[PDB]
Structures are given as structure tokens and as C-alpha cells.
Symmetry: D2
Subunit: 331 residues, 4 copies
């Protein structure tokens, strides 16, 4: 009688346990940009979305599903119940608290802790073996928060950190020199924000050190003002937010690049945030960006970058500031 049975003879029943699943938590502009970038790079065989507002969540799921003909990811699901996230290889956290006028730094972080106390145990319950990738800001502190609540080993808790900062730096270098960002090399490390560290000694094109060629590179009194290129990077989100209200596209592409290294076990090096105690002279439980080898087991190795005394002092001062906030948090 039924059309499906007249057309199709079934040979095998339903044991659907996903094999290459990714979850995005939060369907704000950042989360949806991560989602569309992951879908157009064929990184997952199932995509799950979760957030607390049911109507926008279902509408975003339906909008993506209606494009299925043009994609190669056959299952897209969503819900406020974290059961929809079960058996994920990778869970990307973009949700957080909305900022309030006149609230202190410590109060903002604690409000995000209170949200993570609900999100993280739910994630761990349904995907006990996943990798966690935290994007929510302030990212170095909130990556620590996810690590603390989850109980996961440090190799499986990753912060997006300075990955986009470095991409922006390479684009701006490329604009100045007349070359693609792919062929400009340079690293921004440390705390994601106003105190990140541009490692001038490593900037190069085709292996030619820009500092040896132009020795005053990175000093304020440089007639070409290369120090203001780093200031442009730290101010980039501020300028884009003032023009269009928020940033989305670039972080979505940077996050999908990280997901590609994880899902395909590439062991590429990225400037991302990892638990740094015992390395680079740090003695507290803080997360900072260094060049990390990224693959299917998360962060397996760290590159030991040679830093000047000025550069080391910036990192150590960031570690002190982060721990000062973290030791006052209520878990």
C-alpha cells in the first residue's frame, strides 16, 4: 500500500551511532558562522546545534536543512536537550553571558561560569570522549573554566586563542608587502586581547627574516611603523564591531580551519590556547596561546619558541592577571 514500501525494499535496520559528528553550542552570529563554514568544508557526517532559545534554534536548523541538496553532510539536528549532541568527536562552545553596563571584570566572568556549570556537565555526559574547543570570550579564562568543570585531560581542552589574531596579522602584512597572506609568516602569542605578543623575530617571507633585513622592526620609533600593525590586529574586532555591530565571518573560517586539523589528524601547528603551567616559565594554572601541534587527540605537542626577556615578561604578566581573576571564581 505505502509508496515507500512499493518503491524501496529494506535490507538493513537502524543502528545509527554517528562516526564523524560535530556539535556547535550557541546559534548566535559566531556559532552560525562556524556552522556554515564546517558544512561547506565537508568536515562532519552529522552536525548538531544546541542553545537555550528554542524558536531561533529550530529556525536555523530548518534553514540549513533546506540547503541539503547543495551540501555533503546528510544529518543536521538541533534541540535544547543535550541528548541531540551524543557521541560527538568535537564540541565547539560559542555561548556566553551578555555584557552589562557598569559590571566589573570579575562579575562578567562569574556570570559565564554560572552558564558553563550547566553547559559543560551536559556536554561531558553525552560525549565523554570528545575534544572541547572554546571560542566564547574572554577565551583564555573560559577555556580554563571548561577544563576545571569537565575534568578532562589538558590535551582535550583547546581555546581558539590567537589563531584569528595571527590570521589578521598575516593579512595585514600581505597588504603592506603585495603578497598573499599564505606567503607571509608571523606569530601572535599569549593572552588574546590588548596584551598579545607579536614575535618580531619570527616574521618572514620565503624564510627571509624581516627583522634582520629591517633591524628597527618592532620598535615604536620605526619610520615604517610596523608596531602599529600589531595595534591594528588588537583593535580589529573593535573597529568591525563599531561598523557592523559584531564579528562573525573571520572567526567562523578560523574555527573551521582548527576543526579540519582535528578531524583529519593533520598535526599542523596553530597559535591556540593551552594549559601552560610548567612551560615558558609559568607556575599557575593558566591557558595562553603558543604554537601547538593539533590532531585527532587534540594538542599533543608544543613548539618551544625562543623569546626575548621583554616578550617573556609580557606572558608572565598575563599569567598573573589571569590567575588573579581565576582564584576568585566560585565553582
Amino acid at each position: 500500500a505505502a509508496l515507500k514500501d512499493q518503491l524501496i525494499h529494506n535490507l538493513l535496520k537502524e543502528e545509527h551511532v554517528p562516526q564523524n559528528k560535530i556539535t556547535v553550542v550557541g546559534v548566535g552570529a559566531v556559532g552560525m558562522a562556524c556552522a556554515i563554514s564546517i558544512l561547506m568544508k565537508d568536515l562532519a557526517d552529522e552536525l548538531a546545534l544546541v542553545d537555550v532559545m528554542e524558536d531561533k534554534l529550530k529556525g536555523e536548523m530548518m534553514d540549513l536543512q533546506h540547503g541539503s541538496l547543495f551540501l555533503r553532510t546528510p544529518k543536521i539536528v538541533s534541540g535544547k536537550d543535550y541528548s541531540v549532541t551524543a557521541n560527538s568527536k568535537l564540541v565547539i562552545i560559542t555561548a556566553g553571558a551578555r555584557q552589562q553596563e557598569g559590571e566589573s571584570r570579575l562579575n562578567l566572568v562569574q556570570r559565564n561560569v554560572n552558564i558553563f556549570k550547566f553547559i559543560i556537565p551536559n556536554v561531558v555526559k553525552y560525549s565523554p570522549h570528545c575534544k572541547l574547543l572554546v571560542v566564547s570570550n574572554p577565551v583564555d579564562i573560559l577555556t580554563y573554566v571548561a577544563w576545571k568543570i569537565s575534568g578532562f585531560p589538558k590535551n582535550r581542552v583547546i581555546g581558539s586563542g590567537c589563531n584569528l589574531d595571527s590570521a589578521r596579522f598575516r593579512y595585514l602584512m600581505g597588504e603592506r608587502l603585495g603578497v598573499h597572506a599564505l606567503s607571509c609568516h608571523g606569530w601572535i602569542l599569549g593572552e588574546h586581547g590588548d596584551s598579545s605578543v607579536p614575535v618580531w623575530s619570527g616574521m618572514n617571507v620565503a624564510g627571509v627574516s624581516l627583522k634582520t633585513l629591517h633591524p628597527e622592526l618592532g620598535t615604536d620609533a620605526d619610520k615604517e611603523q610596523w608596531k602599529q600593525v600589531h595595534k591594528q590586529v588588537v583593535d580589529s574586532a573593535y573597529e568591525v564591531i563599531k561598523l557592523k555591530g559584531y564579528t562573525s565571518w573571520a572567526i567562523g573560517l578560523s574555527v573551521a580551519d582548527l576543526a579540519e586539523s582535528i578531524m583529519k589528524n593533520l598535526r599542523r601547528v596553530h597559535p591556540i590556547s593551552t594549559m601552560l603551567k610548567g612551560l615558558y616559565g609559568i607556575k599557575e594554572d593558566v591557558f595562553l596561546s603558543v604554537p601547538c601541534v593539533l590532531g585527532q587527540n587534540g594538542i599533543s605537542d608544543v613548539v618551544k619558541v625562543t623569546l626575548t626577556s621583554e616578550e617573556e615578561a609580557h606572558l608572565k604578566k598575563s599569567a598573573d592577571t589571569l590567575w588573579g581573576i581565576q582564584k576568585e571564581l566560585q565553582f
Copy 2:
């Protein structure tokens, strides 16, 4: 010497004539979804954005530019002046008023006609040889308006039409039958809107006609309610608008599918908006969706679908409705 001159020896003075340029008009949610999809499919060597609000326009340009490292489109430009659009191969028009929750796309015509009076002459002035792809609603009427204003031959003026309607239909078919939309075949023709026509005789999997297998298909007297699948297609935009306020992702992917056929000269068949005088008993200059062969010179051929008496009458009345609106337009 400058650092650039110490590092790089220039051998050639170049003139910037782009060879595969695409312009998106409008940086609303639809326009930006078209932009990110075209960028992630490597369809252009230069992308230009144009709209009337300068701050929002510059912010979106900067956000995309910040993702350059992850892309293979080396030049992204923008501006309110249409000189930034010069020498485009393809110009995609997405600006205009969008439907409220439960509003007919036909209720937008007077507002969007007035906007097209400014846009189309500016586009034609700076890219006299481009193809025009209209996405703004009502898309069938606005493609006619663009054709009249531009003076272009009809093969170069295309509406996105029912490409998305048919993609939605194939997705819903696949969900009912347990197969990917790629392997479900079926066509929605006519108005992109409430009077679209589902061609039941062409619906098939692996060449097996579903109507011959299940003769009740498409009638009210069908226990399985397949006629309601077309109603789901007609209601799709309304349901997503009710949940998130607008639609974006699916139309962006549908538009990128059309741009791929044009830029790569594929000569694939799509259900898109074209001038159908002389067809199905129509003697006025109305545009609506039929299956069209799409390539680098636009629409070169149309497939002549066999319709039932009921299907053809439904096309003819919808064409009369569109003409009733068109003949009263002032531009």
C-alpha cells in the same frame, strides 16, 4: 630603502583588469549568505559588495578580508559608488524590502521597483557586458523590470526563481523516502511564491515514476498526503520567518549553485525565472520558472515540459496574475 623594496624587486608594472569578478548588491542577511557561499566555492577572483549604508558595508568587507588566509579569492572590495563594481562577469541583486511574517512576496513590488530604478542603470553603466541574477522579491516581476531597464538581451537577465523551491521539495521527498535529496528528482515551476506548480508526472527515484507507482499522488484523496509536501514547500519561508525572523542560508546556497553553472559554463538545467512569451499559451512578456539550460552566456535553451491540462491551467492563471501586476508598473 623601504622594507618592501629591501625584500622584493619589482619586475612588472601591472594593470588591474579582473577576469572572473562577481558583485553582490545588498549586504543584508541574504546578500552576505550569497557572499560567504561564493567565497567558499572559489567561483571568483575578485568580489565586490555595494549597498547604501557605508558603515555596515565597510564592516562586512573587513570581516571577509580578515579571513583571507583561509580563502582563495584574493581581492575583496566595497563601496557605495558603483565604480567599485566595474567589469563584473556576474552581478547578483539582493537589496530591497523583505516579507514580514505572513506577508505575500507580491506585496513588496512597489517598494522594490523604486529601488531597482536606481540600482539597474548604475550596474549597466559600469558592467555593460555582465549577466544579471535577480534574487530580490517578487523575483519573477523584478527580473522583468531589470530586463526592461537594462536593455540587455533576455538571455543575460535571470531570476533565482524556483531553484530553491525545488531544492526544498527534493529535501522533503528524501526525508519521507529515506534517501538523499541528490537521488530524489522533482520540479516546482511557475511563480516563486504561493501559486507555484508541482509537476507530479516527473517525480522519480532512479527513473521510477512515483505517480505511475502510486496513482493518488498529488490529489486530496491520498492517505499519505503527498499534496501536503508541496504545501510545505509553499509555506517554507513563512515557517522559517516565524522562527528566526528571516531566511538566509538556503537561498545563499541556491544562488551559489546558479553562479557555479554560469562561471564554469556547465549547461546544467535549473528551474529559474525567464521570459516565457509564446509558451503554454502565454502572449504577454511575463517571467516565471521553467527548466533552463544555464551557462556562461546565461540562459541558452529551455526544456519543454509536458504538463497536464490542470498543470498548464495553473501556470496560465499565475502568469495572468503576474501580468496584472506588471502592466500597472511605473518605471
Copy 3:
């Protein structure tokens, strides 16, 4: 004080188990076209090659490895010992004996059976959960042979069957009609070779049945001679071998498309060879091509195409011939 230890601090020891591994058995021209096509479509995180000629095998492995910079498959391995194939999701069999001057079909099949008696138990020992895709000719008999030796359930033993035949048919359709093969639809079923069945009733563009428009379609006295298009398909490998010595590129692309459906769980429909007992009027353990739903567990469903008396009789005639040979084989 090794350079690797000065540069990199190890944080994690790892016993690496790959998650999306593919093996190609046989590094002849067919096997290597499959390998390059799979590598350029980013379907696997590890590729293994196996063959009996040690030097040629190592040379092909090294040549592919030296392109790693341009790929996203981080590990390529090879060896005569099947331990290099352990934990594969998908194993593709292209090895076998070539047809001899003055030899029966029972004796050519037996020479290939003896090859499969060594290969298949080795594959099963190291990848007990894999799907098997047999490409070696005669493909329908050798897929039966692989199934019998492996002990696998029928859903995990797949023959490439008529998949390329149908792609060639769609290309030739497109050449005659002036449209891309993507927009021409048609199915070749049954036994891969001179006795395959072109299903004239399912051929269409945009859902328009060519048979209804052109009732002579599929008859000998057809002024347009469409039956000769099927004859061109069955002769194609023959014509290419006479021109260049062998065929490879098209089959490599066809096999990678099947691998994509499996690895991404797409549930697309393909005309491939499956154990057909109990369906289409067949009563014995034979494999023939029908439209099959293909995903991460292999063939889960079969489409039941409505066939004419003549069409059904062709399939029954093929099953009788195949079973007659199979019962004479020495396992």
C-alpha cells in the same frame, strides 16, 4: 640535545588508531587512478596500498608521499604484508588476472578465484569490520567470490557493477542533447558486459520521459538509433584499450564517487552489484546491478524498478548463466 627535542616539547604519548582509513589492493593503472582520485577528494585520514610486486609498490607509495604538501591525507603506507591495512573502513579490490589467448570463462574465473583465496582472508583478518568494494573483472562473479570467502553479511560486499556504465551513458546522452551529463538521467542494470540492460523507460531530462516523447526509443528500427548508445557504452573500454592500451581515469573517478557515498553516509542511489536473491525474480545466490542505497554500512536498501517482460527475462537469463559458472568453481 636532538634538534627535535630542542624544538618540540612532547605532552602526550599516543597509540594511533586511524578513524577514516581506506586500502587499495592492486597498484596497476586502475588501482592508482582510484588512489589519486580518493586522495584529491579528502575522503580518508590514512591510505594503504598493497600488491605483490615490492619495488613497484614502494615506488608508487613514495611518489604519492612526495605530494603530501598539496594533500590533506596525512599518512600513506604500503607493503606486501596485509598488516599495513589494519583497521580500514573500506577496502577496494582491483587486483586479478587478465584474459588469456584461448581460454574459457570458467578457467579465467578460476585463475582469479585463486588470487582471491589469498587476498580476501588477509583483508578480513586485519579489518574485520570493513566494507569490501570489488572492481576486478568479471565483477559480478568476483563479488560473489569475495562474499563467500569473507563470511561478511551481504550489506558489506559491494561490486562496482554498472556504475561507470551508467555514467558513460549519461555523458553520451548529454552529447546528443546539448546538456551536461549531470542533467541527463538514465540507468544501466544487470550483468556488467554485453548483456547489461538499458532501462529506456527511466531516461529523462528535467523529469520529461524521452520514451513518451519518442516512442521508437529502444527499438532496433529507431531512425535516431538510440540503441547504439547502449552499444557504445558496452564497447567503450574496448575502444579505449585499442587506442591507449588500457582504461583507468573514468573508473578511478567512478570508484571515488562510491567511496564518497560510503565514507560520508550519503545514502545516494547507485547502480552497483549486490546479492539479489529473492528480488527481481531471482532465486539463486548471484550478484547483479540494481539501484542501491549506499552509506556507512554499505547497501541498506534496493529500489524496485518496474521492468518489462523482456527486461526481466534478460536479468533471469544472466542469473542462470552466473550461477552455472559459480557452481563449477573450486573454493
Copy 4:
């Protein structure tokens, strides 16, 4: 009442000039690896193949065409007559007699010059505005020969040079250090062959100079013997040929990466051979590999690498050797 005319209504007569056409000259194993890699990267809207053997040419064309369903390059053509190559943007030269140990290098130059005296003028007749990419060996001499015969400006005549050599080097670096070749950086410059120059000062991971970390790098007294990695690179082609008879896959992927930079105007930096008179201390009309900015107008800029006195002297000795051969050629 032909089927095509009942099915399709023509609206536009054919006048077709392709917009992104590529020609490959030579359908040996190298030429065909370039062809399949270019096809699987969607770089062209038309691909032409040309060579002197008509049967093999037609067989390779047919094999590729039969895979059209799986590709997005809609037109593939071939012939011995160079009219089939008309209006190419990029023409890739792979034909010639192959380098063989024991066969005089000076005699091979003479044999391949005469082949180019036939090929180059035929290419330029039909594509007067193309870029030339020379892959045939000896590559630095034959790029000069193509430049003299065509009369093209030097930016439009490019040799594949040391591009693959450097890719091989990065793979071998990655195997030693435990990271992907993408994250290992290093440059092989100069004359392609036994006298190429590995630039130890530019080798780095994440901007960390290996030479500063390990000052004996590249010296005979290096306990890890990294000089033997450069020897591995120069010997790689010969070792692969000894194992499987020829080399093809890696060069195909390397050539397709250069083709991507040209067709998409990327302005990425590659170590490829360019006319370097006036730079690096060279005064004669010679081509050697240096880091070159590559885009839609060929090579527009050159990076000036800081070299040691010994490295600088090696490049001069290579230039003297090349001009000694070139000074006796007649065009």
C-alpha cells in the same frame, strides 16, 4: 520531429570563446598527471591535450570525457593540430626526450631544443596572449629556449624549477620533526638538479630558525646529517624511477598548485625558474629558481633572499654553466 527538438527550445545561437582554458602539451605519464590534477581542482572551463601520437591522444581524451559526470570542467578536447589549443590562458609544456643517466646532458639539450622549435611556434600562433609553464627537462635551459623562440616578455615564461624539490624537502622535514609538511618551511633554490642550493638559514617551524637552534645544521660535522636530506631530494626522481619506471604523481600535484596561483591571481610565493639577469649577482640571460610572486600575469616580483658568500658563489657558478650551453644555440 527529432527527439532533441521536441525536448529543447533553442533561444541563442552558439558563439563560444572559452574564458579559463588550459592546454597540456604531451600525454606521457607527467602530462596526464598534470591533466587529472587540474581537472580535480576545477581550475579550467576547457582543457585541451596535444601531442604527436594521434591514437594515444584520442584514447586519453575519451577516458577523461567518460568521467564528466564526476567533474566540473565541461569541455575536454584533443588533437595533433594546434588549432584545438586556441585561446588558452595557460599552456603547460611536458613533451620532450626524458633525462636518462648515461645520456649526455649536452646532447639532450640539442634534442629538446629542436622539439621546442616545433612546439613553441605552434602554441603562440593559436594563443598569442597565454602564459607558458615549462616542465620538460632540463627545465632551466628549456625555459630560456621557450622565451627566445616565443619572444614573450619574461614575466609570461615560467619554469617549474625547484617547486617540487622544495615540496619534497618539506615532507622529509616533517617526517623528521613529527609535524605536517604544511607547518615545515624551507627553500631549495638555483639550478634544478644536483647543484641546487638548500638555504639552511630559512628553515623553520613556527618562525623558530633551526640554524639558530642547531648551528651545525647543513655542515659535514652535523651529528644529525641534515645535508643528506638535501641529497635525498636531488636523488628522489632517480630512486622512484628505479622502483616503478617513472615519476608522475608528485609533479602533477606541484604543477596544479602553480596553475591555481596563476588562474586565481593569488600572488603566492613559489621557488620557480625566472629570468634573473641583474639580480643575485647575475649578468647573463639565464633562468634559475628564486622565490617568485605568481599571479594572472605570470611572475611580477622576486624576493631577494639574503645569501651567504658560499651560497652566492654557487648561484654564479650555475649561471656561468647555463650561459655556456646557451651561447651556442641558434633561434
